[PDB]
Structures are given as structure tokens and as C-alpha cells.
């Protein structure tokens, strides 16, 4: 084994001196024995010369003396992959932090790996069925892309991630991987207890989502490497087993801020708005790996956070170039009577074309978006002129727009304890047929409350006939 000696220790940056020929390369994990801790991981950054290379520790460097033993692992930061990591809380170094024993994995893949080539990529953009009525018709998710989940607190961000992971595992058979990079200490404990009571993470049964711990209480090396540890476990299920995995990075703004902290402390000059110089190289190395291959795909549903409500910043414009879809959760609905608060006009996607979803799906999406945009702009005139001071065409379009806004809000399976209704999982073919019949005049005699908290064309006919008699 290659051994080294610690020469410098200035915070997170620690320099180790090796011998001749046995020097480690870049992105190499270095082992270090401590007291109460198991092993202090230290990823190699660069080599300063004279048999010395600067490394960045992924934990606390307090208590290290000049001349400590630093063993080299020979490769990068390996993590446990496979079906054994489902239901357990992993860290950035691949260790368990749930106090449920060690992860019995057959192999260990490194966090630093190259992405797919141009010949092994998908030649056509496919749509990903989520099960929601406002997702499969409006902003459709692309198979192997990035989706931005923008929203405030208490709008429905945690409920949307749990319902999407359960619907993809039952209709398509794909697992999930929640990598909460830059999260809080209280948010990590509340997310693990809520998933066990709904049926997503079972300790005695079978789990379906991976937990990757990554709070902001550690150093800059652990927060920046939290995105690579969670993406390595999700990519193994699509290359070895072949399944459409879904990766979650909460939040997406914490990954860009953690990369500039380790680069500024090494000696690199800053860029614009105090960002790192390799902003387009660090963000593109992790977004290109979550694509579609010949065996499977890997969807990304990160939560992008704008800096001080500015979309033209260096952390907002760099992540929006690789996002194919967007799940904007505005605060206009929520308490208005929509479950969940999904904006049909603010949520846009690049896969909502006629050459990707067909001519039948493009006509139904354009008709629903035109009726919702005309009813929102006419809300200022209806409150000042009433509802009877309109024409014949404006009165018929305003009545159908009220029932179309509540028909896309279906009750999820994990939200049955808050609304009382059963979970409805509408498919892609059932959602397009129900929206086309309401816009043609086949359901004009139905009530406005018959479409609320329902999903599909069969649920609207059974709820309307049972409401009166």
C-alpha cells in the first residue's frame, strides 16, 4: 500500500507528501485513521510538485498533526451500489448513517467516472409518463433529462417527489435516489420518517428509493461530492439492470455553491458574482451522466433555486441550459382547491412538440393552454363588470375553463390521509382522451365540482351521476 505523510493542514485543504513513483493521481481518495471516526476521506485535487499533492478533506481536519500516516486507496471515492442501498441513509463516502448495519454490496463503483459517448446516446427524445394529469399533458418530462422543481415552502414539493417515485416503480418498475445535497439537519430527519409511513421506504419489506445524506454541517468537500455519490447509485440500475431511475437533488443551487467554495480555497481566482472559474465544466460533468443509454435512462428532478429572484445569475442560467422540463409550483393555487399546486401556464418543457408526442397530443395541449391563458387575463375584467356582461362565446369559454383547471388536479396515493379521496393514477392515453372530450362540448352539461379531485374520463362520469342522485 502507498503511504504518505501530512505536510500542511490549513482547514479543508491538506497537503500530503508521497514517494517517487507511488504518487496518486487526481480525484483519488486518501484514507486517514482518526480516533472516533472510521476513516477520513481526502480527495486529491492537484499536484504541486516535488513529491507533493494538495488534497481536500471531506470531513473535519481538527486534530491532525504534521507527519500523520496517509494511506492511498488507489482509486476514487467508491460507494455502495445495487439493491442493498435501497432504504438506507448513505453518505458522500458510501458509508451508512442510519445505524442499521453495513451495506452488504457485491461491488463498489467510483464517484468519478466519464459520461456516455455520442454513439451510445439516444437519437430520439422520448416522453416519461409520470401519472399526473397536469404533467403528462402540459410540461411533459423527457426520458433522460433534467426537470426543475421550483416552488416555495408548503406548496407541495415533498408530496410531489413521493408520489412520482411510487408511480414510476409500479407502472415502469424504476427505483429512485434522493440525494439531498446542502440540506438542513431538521429536514433530513423529517424526510426519512415521512417516507416510512407512506410505503416508499420499508425496513422489513422492500424499499424503492435511496437516501443520500448531505447536510451543510460538514466541510466544502463533502457538500460538493454529494451530487456524485447519489448519481453513481442511480446510474448503476440503468446500465446493469436497465431501469428508468429518477434522481433528486434538493436543492440544485447547493451543488453550484459547494463547488465554488473548494475552488476558492485552493488558489483559483473567482469569476462573475463571486463564482468559480469552471462553472460550465463542473455543472456539465454531472448533468451529462444522467442521460439515456441503450440499456436504460436516468431522469433528474432537481429543485432549482433562483438567487435573490434573479434568473440571469451565474447559478441560474448555467443550470437552465440542460433542463428539458420544468415543474413550477406557484403559490396561487394550493389553498384555492387544487391538489397539487401545479401551474398549467408557468410549467414549460421542450418535449411538448408535435414531433415527439404526436399530432394528437400536441393539439390537446395547445387547446388547454389557450383556454387557461384567456381565462387568467380576463379575471381583472370579470371582477369589475360582473359575469353576465359578456358575449355568447366568452360565456361558454369561461364555464369550461373552471372545470378544466380542477380536472388536472388528481389525488395522489400518498396524499390520501390529507384529502380523504383515493389515489388515481391516470395514464398518458386516458389523460389525452378526457381533455379532448371536454373541449369539444361532450361534457358541457356537467357541473364544475364533478371534475375536482378526479382523474380520467371514467371518474368524471361516475362522480357527476352520484352527486345529485
Amino acid at each position: 500500500p502507498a503511504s504518505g505523510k501530512i505536510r500542511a493542514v490549513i482547514g479543508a485543504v491538506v497537503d500530503v507528501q508521497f514517494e517517487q513513483g507511488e504518487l496518486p493521481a487526481i480525484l483519488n481518495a486518501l484514507t486517514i485513521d482518526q480516533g472516533n471516526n472510521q476513516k477520513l476521506v481526502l480527495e486529491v485535487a492537484q499536484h504541486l510538485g516535488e513529491n507533493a499533492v494538495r488534497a481536500i478533506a471531506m470531513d473535519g481536519t481538527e486534530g491532525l498533526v504534521r507527519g500523520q500516516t496517509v494511506v492511498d486507496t488507489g482509486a476514487p471515492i467508491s460507494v455502495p451500489v445495487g439493491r442493498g442501498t435501497l432504504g438506507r441513509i448513505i453518505n458522500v463516502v458510501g458509508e451508512p448513517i442510519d445505524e442499521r448495519g453495513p451495506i452488504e454490496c457485491k461491488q463498489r463503483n467510483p464517484i468519478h467516472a466519464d459520461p456516455p459517448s455520442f454513439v451510445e446516446q439516444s437519437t430520439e427524445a422520448e416522453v416519461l409518463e409520470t401519472g399526473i394529469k397536469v404533467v403528462d399533458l402540459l410540461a411533459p418530462y423527457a426520458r433522460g433529462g433534467k426537470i426543475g422543481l421550483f416552488g416555495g415552502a408548503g406548496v407541495g414539493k415533498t408530496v410531489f417527489i413521493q408520489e412520482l417515485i411510487n408511480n414510476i416503480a409500479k407502472a415502469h418498475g424504476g427505483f429512485s435516489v434522493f440525494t439531498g445535497v446542502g440540506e438542513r439537519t431538521r429536514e433530513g430527519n423529517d424526510l426519512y420518517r415521512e417516507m416510512k409511513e407512506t410505503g416508499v421506504i420499508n425496513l422489513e419489506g422492500e424499499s424503492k428509493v435511496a437516501l443520500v445524506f448531505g447536510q451543510m454541517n460538514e466541510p466544502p468537500g463533502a457538500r460538493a461530492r454529494v451530487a456524485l455519490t447519489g448519481l453513481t447509485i442511480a446510474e448503476y440500475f440503468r446500465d446493469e439492470e436497465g431501469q428508468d431511475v429518477l434522481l433528486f437533488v434538493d436543492n440544485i443551487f447547493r451543488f453550484t455553491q459547494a463547488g465554488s467554495e473548494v475552488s476558492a480555497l485552493l488558489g483559483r481566482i473567482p469569476s462573475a458574482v463571486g463564482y468559480q472559474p469552471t462553472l460550465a465544466t463542473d455543472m456539465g460533468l454531472l448533468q451529462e451522466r444522467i442521460t439515456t443509454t441503450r440499456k436504460g435512462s436516468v431522469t433528474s428532478v432537481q429543485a432549482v433555486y433562483v438567487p435573490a429572484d434573479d434568473l440571469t445569475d451565474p447559478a441560474p442560467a448555467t443550470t437552465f441550459a440542460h433542463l428539458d422540463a420544468t415543474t413550477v409550483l406557484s403559490r396561487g393555487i394550493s389553498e384555492l382547491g387544487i391538489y397539487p399546486a401545479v401551474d398549467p401556464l408557468d410549467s414549460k418543457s421542450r418535449l411538448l412538440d408535435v414531433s415527439v408526442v404526436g399530432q394528437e397530443h400536441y393539439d390537446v395541449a395547445t387547446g388547454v393552454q389557450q383556454t387557461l391563458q384567456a381565462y387568467k387575463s380576463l379575471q381583472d375584467i370579470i371582477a369589475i363588470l360582473g359575469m353576465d356582461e359578456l358575449s355568447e362565446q366568452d360565456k361558454l369559454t369561461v364555464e369550461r375553463a373552471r372545470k378544466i383547471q380542477r380536472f388536472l388536479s388528481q389525488p395522489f396515493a400518498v396524499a390520501e390521509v390529507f384529502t380523504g379521496i383515493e389515489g388515481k393514477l391516470v395514464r398518458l392515453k386516458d389523460t389525452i382522451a378526457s381533455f379532448k372530450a371536454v373541449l369539444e362540448g361532450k361534457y358541457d352539461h356537467l357541473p364544475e365540482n364533478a371534475f375536482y379531485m378526479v382523474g380520467g374520463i371514467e371518474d368524471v362520469v361516475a362522480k357527476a351521476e352520484k352527486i345529485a342522485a
Partner: protein, 51 residues
């Protein structure tokens, strides 16, 4: 009096709509000036510390 009150409502709606467009243009200029002020202040401290 009814014609003057109806004309005042149209002028107030046009003034509120014109104020929203000017606030959107001023927000784009304030966002670019805030990012340029952080880059100009950080470049002055990096130039004096490297000399």
C-alpha cells in the same frame, strides 16, 4: 360625472399597467447591476492581495 368616473378608471388601469412594465425593466437592470457590483468589488480585493 358618470363619463368622468368611467374615463378615470381607464386612465388608472393604463397607469397601473405602464408602471408594471417599467418595474420589470428596472428589475432586469438592478439584477445586472447587483452582479456587476459583486464582481467589481471582488476584483479589487484580489488585485491588492496578489501584489
Amino acid at each position: 360625472y358618470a363619463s368622468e368616473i368611467s374615463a378615470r378608471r381607464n386612465a388608472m388601469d393604463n397607469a397601473s399597467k405602464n408602471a408594471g412594465e417599467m418595474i420589470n425593466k428596472y428589475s432586469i437592470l438592478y439584477n445586472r447591476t447587483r452582479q456587476a457590483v459583486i464582481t467589481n468589488e471582488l476584483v479589487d480585493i484580489i488585485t491588492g492581495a496578489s501584489s
